[PDB]
Symmetry: D3
Subunit: 284 residues, 6 copies
């Protein structure tokens, strides 16, 4: 029996449930209750505060959690990052009032407000800089106008929050917010290593599969050699005859980020009815 911690609210909650569903786990019956028991898969899911998930995995009984990479950097927990999940990512920056040409060295002896004080204190220490780091519970950007701090450190999205308070980011970026699957450190006893390996392989199938599309298309046999070079697939393309003997159908996996260039090339050699379909799971 495995126990898995899932974010109960915020930007990571829906895509976390989505990826767990595509790996074949029971979806949350209703957003009101806070556990979901999966008897067929032998897993129980707990919906918890995002900022706490790393502590639950690292000091508690949870085998796995899904949380942001910055929240693991801030927690001080000793957990293993098994997979980057491909969503939720965003930079983490120092920021200060526009129009003063701030640089990292200006932070020495200043007051820096953040919701991630342990992350920031370790970053400054590595750079050899001492400052006064002030923990706040949320929305730190207004703390400069209101006199609590000289600079801040926070997740930045597209900079909307910074510009709305006349702040400019500076310095080298910190530990980012990408969603990760974390695992409790420790070997335990074989029979539990196996159940843990199974969950990781299943989530990995979604993480990998979601990077590709399946292309299906009709192709003249005369253009078949060129098509094979254009879509080599993961092993080699599938080739099947059509009723018309001068034609075949070709099936091949292609990366999402390559798809439109690939289709233009296929169209130019005579390919017709070029179909593209979502992949949600693939065990390579």
């Amino acid at each position: 029996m495995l126990r898995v911690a899932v974010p109960n609210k915020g930007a990571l909650s829906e895509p976390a449930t989505e990826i767990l569903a595509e790996a074949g786990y029971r979806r949350r019956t209703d957003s009101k209750d806070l556990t979901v028991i999966d008897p067929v898969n032998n897993v129980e899911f707990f919906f918890l505060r995002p900022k706490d998930i790393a502590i639950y995995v690292g000091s508690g009984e949870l085998d796995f959690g899904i949380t942001g990479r910055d929240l693991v950097c801030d927690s001080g927990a000793q957990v293993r990052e098994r997979l980057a999940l491909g969503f939720g990512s965003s930079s983490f920056r120092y920021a200060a009032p526009a129009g003063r040409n701030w640089t990292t060295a200006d932070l020495a002896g200043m007051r820096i407000a953040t919701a991630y004080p342990n992350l920031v204190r370790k970053d400054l220490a590595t750079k050899g800089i001492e400052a006064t780091v002030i923990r706040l519970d949320g929305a730190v950007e207004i703390s400069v106008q209101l006199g609590v701090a000289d600079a801040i450190a926070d997740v930045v999205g597209s900079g909307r929050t910074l510009s709305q308070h006349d702040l400019v980011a500076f310095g080298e970026p910190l530990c980012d917010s990408e969603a990760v699957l974390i695992e409790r450190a420790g070997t335990d006893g074989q029979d539990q290593t196996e159940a843990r390996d199974q969950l990781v392989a299943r989530v990995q199938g979604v993480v990998f599969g979601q990077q590709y599309l399946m292309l299906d298309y009709d192709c003249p046999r005369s253009a078949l050699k060129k098509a094979t070079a254009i879509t080599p697939g993961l092993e080699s393309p599938t080739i099947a005859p059509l009723a018309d003997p001068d034609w075949v159908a070709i099936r091949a996996l292609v990366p999402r980020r390559d798809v439109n260039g690939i289709m233009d090339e296929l169209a130019a050699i005579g390919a017709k009815a070029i179909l593209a379909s979502d992949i949600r799971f693939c065990r390579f």
Copy 2:
């Protein structure tokens, strides 16, 4: 022209609309209005109170409805259950205050509160027991604390509601809450038998299809004989050559509940890029 009753709210409403959409019927334009006319399929959908749907099919002009099996047991309507739809199921139990070792025979002459009084009265009669059954409109669990009844009878999910009121279930379970497609009894006149048969076949295609996944995978020809035994499919697996002549691609339907064991076996004989896809409709 067929008329079909659909639950307008509650746990059965979204999965009911989902299954009707996958059978190819027009989805509800907006959740505010209460009918949806499907001119191409020649069907009209009415969104009604769940507890009333069985009466509308059994005494009204509706040809079909989707409701819970317990609501058909409680209604006294004479309708045909054509299909179990595979969602919404839950046990229906007697329950009484924890710590008293209640058994079914203790109900004789007691006061039993329930939202399904006809269901309960028929269950007790079959067992030869007489008691006083008290109809309530909803949420019956609090009626024991408040002195209206000695025991209750209600749908139980995972027992959250019972434990939150210090109640323990006992006795043989009653008619459960699984969602069913019900049909009005009666033969009418041939031309309407045909239209009715068509809807049932279409919903049955979703009910059946949703129990499987399509597996696609690349396979060495040397492992082909073993693969065929591992995934026999519904008739026999599809086999197509890859460009590489030592390899093929195999397609086969497999039951959802079998999928992960099947993939482990395929991986161990040399299969690569094992893909798994949702099935939403299959006419066997």
Copy 3:
């Protein structure tokens, strides 16, 4: 870099985002902010008032928009309609109090209330009729009861709004509400013609693909000649052997509106496990 205007609310908003997602564009991160930048596709999406989108494309810097055909008729903008998108369509009618046998000629010299005054004034002019057209901001049906107008002109859905105010539609219908992709008129400079052509081809792939389903089915070889005539596909059906040598699997695109007749015919010649799957993109 392309700029595309998307309806920010109303009946057209979700299906507009849906079609853009299926063409492979970044979906709106959250419904609160009003732009979405797509760096990989080199497109920026702006979420605007539906009634304004035609003016933004026709007089502004936007390259494309998605809006209703009636809103283009009302705007007076000079834009190109590139594609009908297949949703949101509804008739646009004159309407007047029930029980008076209104005809189009009765409008001469009357007061007509509408949210689309330029559309209505051009329609009347073409028919040679002069009347007083009164602009209102919304919900015009009540304006007759309240004495502001003698008749109205409005989008009609299924006539719910008309019957709820005792109004009956009459006359030839006007410019309808179907969703369209519009483009700014003008040739600019080659390098921008190409980027524009790419977006249109991608949306066209969704518009075309969404009219079909992929049929997959197992078929006895003895029935193969008949099956080929029943499902000719877009080019010709794919044919692949099963393990069992007396059988094959057939793949073919078929129109959504044909699917159930097609399956009945296939069942009657011996086809088994007839599968039907959504198509979301097809470049013919």
Copy 4:
């Protein structure tokens, strides 16, 4: 310790909480939980389904409830109606399809759908009429179109629901929906009679007070005799001098429904600064 049942949702819920607050009882801390304990007043409030409240008072341990008068007529409970609360009232009527001149005698042997079957069966019996009364859970108006019943019986507001289904009300009205304070029948033991009397007196203070306004106004002494006749108050008006010796200020309770006529009369005899204030509690 008293236990009081309060409607947990619907049209009666907010005005019920409002009247209990004005009688000085602790207001519901948050709409999520379902009890509120009032330690200073020695009362506990339970928020329950409206249709069940009469059964909880009549067969349970609750001392009081607030519910509709029709729900008491339908419940069959033996409870005392202590006060009409002055909100929620509405007529209860038979109704049938427009354009057929239905009368009460046409109901004999017909099918009548209603959410209040016991109320309707007793009403028909008193009139000497036999019919088939069909219990439904809610929204009964559509049951005629859908073939379940020939006529209905339901609360009517302003007839919106009737006209929206082409129904016309007929016959003598039934037990109406006005909100009432009900009490469990029975004398118990003196010390509990006293606590019960206290709650009734406190709610009665709100019921009575809410029918009046306090008028305050400045008045010339020369017009004082006429003013006294215009506002006699509940006992006799309060009269106090102003600094200016030719003037006084007058205070008097007047009925809400009389207020504007009263003010016109006072203005015409020389009264100035006529103030009118809400009364929320008055023990006569």
Copy 5:
């Protein structure tokens, strides 16, 4: 029977209903339906789009409406403004991109976007300036960035919307957004003049009363002469004895905006228990 138009949504809707309630009219039973009939006061209220209310009063059968003063300036309707209601007010300004020193004369021949084109065209004409005014449906501030206009004209609150798009207001302000009670022009026939006068007097009682508070306080008789000068009231203060013969209680209306200075002065001459209460209606 009077008909009154009330804003159905937006910033003016709740305070409009609030002021009508304090004048003693029936409050909207539920926000879903769109009329409210007041049988005791002989008035019917219609909840309409704010931008349309002036047209309904000026060309329709409505006797009164509540809307913004700018919406009357934009409508071109011939209505009487009877009262300023004391809420909803905000300036209406031209605005253009920051950092260019725009002045009113720079508008000549430019493109100006606004939701109030008739208001703007009349303002420019009075100043002798010709420009191209572009009607938009809402949120006009983004139209400059997007190339549709050179400048805008819009209601400004505290400038949040302007600064969020880098716009600066300039020039003389236009017709503002303060809420007003408007009346249809025309004398009709005596018996309807009277009913109209009554509504205006009742709303005026709220408009006037809401500018004051009632002060009540205990005062030594030795300080009575000074107190009388500090709170003269609307006519002269009320003076009543306390049980203690060296003391009195004083009652007087004072303006809300004066209240705190007044209390400081009273405290400094020996006044105790200085009470201050809301006034919701006063007929002077």
Copy 6:
């Protein structure tokens, strides 16, 4: 110009805005924006995270804030508590799994989870006990079941959260959650001492006034001496004649918690029309 911090969400937010409104400050225009400027009172209100308000007052530029007393204990800020506001109060307790007879001394060397780690660490130190205090972001009760802690420390309301996780509170209570007005420590410069004193006096007027009701009642002169003893008021009751010379009207402040006993006594000596009204502000 004063700056005041107000809770932006949670149980303290609405009653905080309510008390500020009754002291005569501008109410939040809309819950979306996060500042409100009051030009007439010369105060600006900032709506912030509750857990941060003490830090904003203690280290920032804010003059005042409203927050929970426990949040001040947890913050470590050096602020002055000027007033207890009379809402939001609740006990703060250690808690551990039911059925083990936990006492305070059992905490030595254990793991204690809490959202208020500084509060807990100072409480344990004062008692001479060392333990490991684990910071969590919220909802700490589940941390025992999930293995992160042996005991917790949290605000308890009525114990719903404790019993829902099988926890029992024990030990002496900690710093409670009552809402307080806090002020920045420091004298600054006279002209700002005065503006600060004014706000405190105004909030104090609400805090004091809200503990009383105004009683108004008609009284026979023969019972006047007894009535004066029953309602002495804050100074002495107001006495004014009625028109009827055998009667008077009496006005007196009485404590809310005394009101019903007081009215029973007045009724028994002949008092009639006993009226009771809310007090929202009183400067003693």
